[PDB]
RNA sequence: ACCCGAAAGAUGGUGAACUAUGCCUGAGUAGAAUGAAGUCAGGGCCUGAUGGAGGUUCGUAGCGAUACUGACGUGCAAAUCGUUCGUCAAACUUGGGUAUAGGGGCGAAAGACUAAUCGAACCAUCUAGUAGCUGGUUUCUUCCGAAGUUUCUCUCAGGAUAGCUGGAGUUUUGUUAGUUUUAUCAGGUAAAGCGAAUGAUUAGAGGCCCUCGACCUAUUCUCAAACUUUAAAUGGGUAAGAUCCAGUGGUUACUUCAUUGAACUGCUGGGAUUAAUAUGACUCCAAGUGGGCCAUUUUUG
RNA sequence: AGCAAUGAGUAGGAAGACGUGGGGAUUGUGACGAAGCGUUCGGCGUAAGCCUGCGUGGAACAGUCUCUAGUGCAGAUCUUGGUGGUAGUAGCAAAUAUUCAAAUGAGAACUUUGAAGACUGAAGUGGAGAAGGGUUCCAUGUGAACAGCAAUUGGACAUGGGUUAGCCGGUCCUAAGCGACAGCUUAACUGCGUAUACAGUACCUCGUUUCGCGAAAGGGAAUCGGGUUAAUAUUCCCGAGCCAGGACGUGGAUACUGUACGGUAACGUAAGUGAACUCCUCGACGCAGGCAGGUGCUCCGGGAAGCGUUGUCUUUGCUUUUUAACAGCCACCCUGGAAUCAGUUUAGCUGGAGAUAGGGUUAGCUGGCUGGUAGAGCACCUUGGAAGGUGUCCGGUGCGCUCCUGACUGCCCUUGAAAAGAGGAGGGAAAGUUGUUAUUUACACCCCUGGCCGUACCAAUAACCGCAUCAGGUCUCCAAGGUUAGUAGCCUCUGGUCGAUAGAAUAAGGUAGAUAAGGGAAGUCGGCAAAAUAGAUCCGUAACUUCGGGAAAAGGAUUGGCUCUGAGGGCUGGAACAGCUAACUCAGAACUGGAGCGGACAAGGGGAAUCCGACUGUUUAAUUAAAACAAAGCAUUGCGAUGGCCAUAACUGGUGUUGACGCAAUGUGAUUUCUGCCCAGUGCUCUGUCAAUGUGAUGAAAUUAAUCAAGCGCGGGUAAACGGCGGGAGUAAUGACUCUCUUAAGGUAGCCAAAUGCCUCGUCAUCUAAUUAGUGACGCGCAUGAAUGGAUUAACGAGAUUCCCACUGUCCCUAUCUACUAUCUAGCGAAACCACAGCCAAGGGAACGGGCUUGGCAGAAUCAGCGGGGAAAGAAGACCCUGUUGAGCUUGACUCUAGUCCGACUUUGUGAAAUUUACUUAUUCCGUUAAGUUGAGACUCAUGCUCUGCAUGUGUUUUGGUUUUAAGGUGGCCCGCUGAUCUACGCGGAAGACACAGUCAGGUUGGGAGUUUGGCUGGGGCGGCACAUCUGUGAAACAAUAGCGCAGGUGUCCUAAGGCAAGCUCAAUGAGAACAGAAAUCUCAUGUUGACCAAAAGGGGAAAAGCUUGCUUGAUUUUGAUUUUCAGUACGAAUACAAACUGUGAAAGCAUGGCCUAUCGAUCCUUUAGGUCUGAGAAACUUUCAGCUAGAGGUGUCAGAAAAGUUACCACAGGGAUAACUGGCUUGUGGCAGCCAAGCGUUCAUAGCGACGUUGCUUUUUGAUCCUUCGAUGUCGGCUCUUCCUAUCAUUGAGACGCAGAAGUCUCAAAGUGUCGGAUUGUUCACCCGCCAAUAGGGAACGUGAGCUGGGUUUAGACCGUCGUGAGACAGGUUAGUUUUACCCUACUGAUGACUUGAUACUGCGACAGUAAUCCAACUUAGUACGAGAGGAACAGUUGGGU
């Protein structure tokens, strides 16, 4: 008996998200009229850091085209982009660094950052500091759009999602060493509390499917099955293939 | 269901005032030591200042609790007191508000903590839960008076079954017996046996040159729970007449070569206790008991 | 009534009586005394019980026959209540402390007042709040009880009284979060809840957020001084103000063809309009560091008051000298143009994106001056018996302490809330025509109102929580002097307190605290405890190293007082001079002293190595702080959102305000250095089997072949997945090398008797006088080894070991001193425990008696101690076993199951083609403030072609501006349309008849549930089957008869090895026969069974029961009886007939399987065989079904459940029916002593020995056993202390010798005296170094835990190795882990003490008990005796030493 840690995550309550001091949640500037016809003129009036992610985001004033008042979205930053810099969101904007088009318009080849997955959809894709998508190729018509993952794998889109030129900012965050366990404390205390994990070895074997035993050993397969229910679910699920690569 | 007694199970509720962790908003922590980058001068990268970094060191308050295995141990105290000791600007200490609840929580992981309650809280109920196991079980006399053995049992600390015991009814008095005698059988122990079989065993004799051998013939030493020709004592069986003996007729699908037999029956004779000694001899219902121990002789490890 | 015989009794049965509460019937008693109670007035009955005198009592009760029951108590660790002994006992001992007088009172160690003396010692025991408490606050009064002595006192008791607000808080805002709306789930209970139609009577034009709760520390309108009450105050009063809301009036500003002026500017002044809408500011924010300035505090000096000291000195020491909120006044611009760069901070920074400089503007604090304001407050003086006065002044100082501000500098993979509310600006909507106007409601003055609730007191060594007036705990603020670096320690001022039962003595033993000559760890498991070191200055500082450290390494010297000298600033008038003057900081010298001086306080012991963990950090609240957890680094895994992981009954949520430099799931554990081989096993992963449905055939119909998803198979990959990594001979003592059997691979690099090596105290060095320890090597390593990570490693450690120096009372070896106790008194005053009680020896006994038997004995009553006994007390043994008792945990146990994967059907419609791909409206997902979609059209320029063309086409992109209440054009008499195109009401996309969802079907599913995990048993377990069953023996001559006794056997085999008849004779021996023998085949003779009969062993058998041939199937059918086990039940096995039908033989007969003794199975269920059979209950027919009778399918635990582990995290009921200790029986084993005489002993059995044999003793070894103990006798060893035994090591006196002397060996009387210091180990033992006369062996519950110690063993944490798939296990190793109570009785040791032919006093006697001395050495005897020589004694005498 006894309900494992990785079960308790979800139940919520004490695992939940630390978002008190987050600064909004960033986006692009939701699909308008005026974007998907020519264009619209951004003022970039702040640089901020966001607490509990490594990208600045730079806050932008652009012109209601409606109304007399004047609306603020937060973006995720492209690096190179300065406070006094006008951005340019639209379909007829020119491919600099700061602007957004939709990726048929941008020739292939273009390095691309916080990209739509559909039409509309404000932007989820590359959004890490450091991280981009890179055009690869588009269709005959230019309706649909291949594109590159951080990750690797490759991805079909639609042409009329759009995304920011250029990397994102705080790139290469992960070179230096966290040389302290403080300095790993200030890190997960403004994200959720993840920190610091226990060896499933060392708990007892109510606790977890690991622990027990006058060795500190695992005892059967570390290697999981996908079908495996909650809480056999542990160690190295539905893995393919172990041990170090190459 | 004679009375009292579990470890537990389930149903429905109450708790984060202690403690575990997250969140929001407040507060807190002398004085020394060491002297990182940065900067200024002088000398040809060294020398001197400057500077004030660090999950740095010494050490107050505060948080903690190593040793004395000190004091105390019907305490001041259901965890305290003394001297000593750890850390002290951080993965720190802490108030209030807020979130997480019982096979659930929370856990820098000890099965820790969750109101002195934790390898599954507390409260009430189902509940007088169940117990082949402990402990108790309340007046007097009178009469009779056991068993620890049989078989079956998930049986070996319990049952059922028979026996031993009591009570309630009857049948009934030349019939009973833990005994001998008279006559007749069965038995293979004790002893005895090996110049009897079977098995074990010592000793010599007598049967082309030896030679111990061979084997044979008659003898000899000693033996046997799983060898025996022979064979006691003590025990065991049956019989000793009225529920008998004889003569004669009938019945019969049996039996015979045949009223030849066989068994059963009718009648007619013969006989009253036909060895000793003593002596009146079913049915029902039910209890307790099913741990036994000892002694003389026999006897197995 | 008579006669005779008989009379024990637990468990148990039956019979007759006695007694109790009520009902029915009947006979009665009683206020002239009922019931009950007490009693030496008594009586009766075998007894239960009954009757009754006397006393008390005051109102109801009884006898008899019946009916009825909540009907009889010594026990239950029974229940409730009451009361003892223990006992006037334990005890009232922390927080330094009280004393004297007078007053009050019945009464004073304790109340109050004075005087002394102490403590607290501003991170106070002081002054104020919160939580919590709730009248404890204040006054007056008091009989109890309470305040562990007292009490005149009180937080007690009683009767009264007390809490005053526009400004102090709540109230208002929003945070983390929490209630509800729309709806959505669920039977509801619940659970989710950001979805929605939520200004200018009438006319327009705007319109995106939903209501509320949530802070007495966050945000926020405004208050301060003095006085006052027995108890309230920023709340009352006196005085001085301020704020929110709303406002009259008089007098000023400004405008009147339209909102003030001034300055170059930064910005300014008594005023100086600003609607809709929009943007901005404040509210609004981290930590550390120093620097500057300020408030308050502290400090030094002068002046004026009062006070203190005065034998002596002292122009002296101390206290007072104060000023509130409120109100007024005291970075940026211009000129200019910088390099020979300049300005500038403690620190760095600043500057042609305009520095220095000169002149301005602005911000400010808790700064200065005046008002407030001296009338108040404070300190004094004089007249009244409360009236009136003077004074309150003027300056310094600082790395000082406190809080605040300001600008800087640094730190972060940490960047440090929101909203209410107040204001500014852009905008220009409105109004206003020289007067009742109109903007000013904060232009100045004036006027009015301010609700509701809290408000006392404590806030803790007595108001809270711990059951209490409890040495405990509980958030915040202020924070003086001296010493000092210092909020350290030590002493003091203000404020507070003396509350804690006292007095007397000064024994042992305690508790804490001191000190010890010589030696210096010899003590001990172990340096445990305690010593020693300690501050500052100057000098000096290694190995090793991750170059940062180590480092305060190690190792040295100095310090006091007094008198001097030198160096270090600031402000004034213009070569540097002249005047006035203020800090505590360094350096040095002289002198002086009992060589002291960080003089008290405070304050590191150090060094050399090994093991583990890198470090800081964390942990088992109340036995474990570590080597365990975590950690950074390293590595693996899954996932691109219709997704990964996870929650949920459902709806739907978390991760996610997220997007691979991310989230999720694991393992290793810094750095350095490396991580070898194995994919067969078990997982994980990659691309034949065969469910439901549906289809087709059969038959009257129910029923009864193909097709056939996932998974499993088949085929790959994967070890930083779980894991795994060999033997044997030969070969130059050794085996480079060759051969051989075998694995998926055969342990590579490294490391080792390790925290890991059984043998093992391994072997060799080193440290030691001596080392089961430590270190360094050596490896066939029981059982090392590579992210189950291997090998290292500086720094670090309340970690585990060893050695050295220093230092010590740990030790030799104990001794003294101090306080509080114990002790004695006054007052007060418990509890555990208690069958009855308390002197021993032996005996027997349930095998260690206080009581019993036989002895020794035995004299009141008491006090202080003590720990031998009471198998003392504390707990229904936590170890062990039993139970058809549990629970936690695991899994390849049994039965399931949330979840998930897969197929079918519904949802589910419209098209097309020969299963694929079109449509969009179901359904699904995303986005928006549902704003610009579909298809046509022109407005501008533009690549440019032709003015008008199809278009391909674009138009804001040059700067951190602005874009809102449209202008223009044009029509209605002051209001419209166009500008701003028509189109069709599809908000815009993505997916789409698939997903999703519902119901079935199959696979997977310790994630989870429920349950199980046999018995016998010289304890359980392991082993075995004695669990069904056969033979022989045990077995004691009928039968019966046990053990985990003995020797063996069975779960079959066979159409013949069944049945019958006939013929024949077997094993073996003897003598014979070409090839031929020891064995072939043939022949005769002899052959009592010596062969053979399917198999164990035993019976039985010769014209057979054996062998060979012939013919056959009785091994068949129908059911009963009997025997065997036995209850006289069943099964099985067998026997004897009956009624059939067959076989063989001439026939008699024989044959119902094997010549006889073993060879096997209920109910339920399934299955087949039999009948012209019975039933399906409205009636026929006819499939299927149910029956009746007989076989088979099987339970071996064999009279018949369906079933794995583990618990050291454990629990319950029990058990001495049953193990681990002592004790008891036994004595194999161990130990000790005899008997015989083969030999040894030059010769000689016996001086001394003693084989082959053989007889005893012992309970100091170890077994064997299970009698005692499981509602507990505290399990090793050491220390301490006593006594006993003798089987004598030494000492005394002898005897024998292979005894010359010396030295010995053997034996007798002998237990009087003695038997030691150390190294290693927990040791008991052992083995060494040394001494000595000698270092003998044992017992006393394997003496000795209310005597200690806790090293070992034996709980819970953790590590390694081997074993296990795992939880876990180990008579394998390793480290960390609570040792409770005496005051009872006796015993022992000490203390008084009643009484006896009187009192009292002194001197004595000595029954009896206890005993004390014992060893060695030197000098002479003596270089003598004796001896071939070497060597070498003794007694008497003398002198010392040990214990």
Request: glycine content about 14%; aromatic content about 6%.
């Amino acid at each position: 008996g006894r309900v494992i840690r990785a079960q308790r995550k979800g139940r919520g309550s004490v695992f939940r998200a630390h978002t008190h001091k987050r600064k909004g949640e960033a986006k692009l500037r939701p699909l308008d009229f005026a974007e998907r016809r020519g264009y619209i003129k951004g003022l970039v009036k702040d640089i901020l850091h966001d607490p509990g992610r490594g990208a600045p985001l730079a806050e932008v004033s652009f012109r209601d085209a409606y109304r007399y008042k004047l609306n603020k979205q937060r973006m995720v930053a492209v690096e190179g982009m300065y406070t006094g810099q006008f951005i340019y969101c639209g379909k007829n904007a020119a491919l600099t660094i700061g602007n957004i088009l939709p990726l048929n318009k941008m020739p292939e080849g273009t390095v691309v950052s916080n990209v739509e997955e559909k039409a509309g959809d404000r932007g989820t894709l590359a959004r890490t500091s450091g991280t981009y998508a890179t055009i690869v190729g588009h269709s005959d018509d230019g309706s649909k759009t291949r594109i590159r993952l951080p990750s690797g794998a490759r991805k079909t889109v639609s042409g009329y999602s759009r995304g920011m030129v250029g990397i994102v900012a705080g790139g290469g965050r992960i070179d230096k060493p966290m040389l302290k366990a403080g300095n790993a404390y200030h890190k997960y205390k403004v994200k959720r509390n993840c920190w610091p994990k226990v060896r499933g070895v060392a708990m007892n074997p109510v606790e977890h499917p690991h622990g027990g035993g006058n060795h500190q050993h695992i005892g059967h397969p570390s290697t999981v099955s996908r079908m495996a229910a909650p809480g056999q679910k542990v160690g190295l699920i539905a893995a393919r293939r172990t041990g170090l690569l190459r």
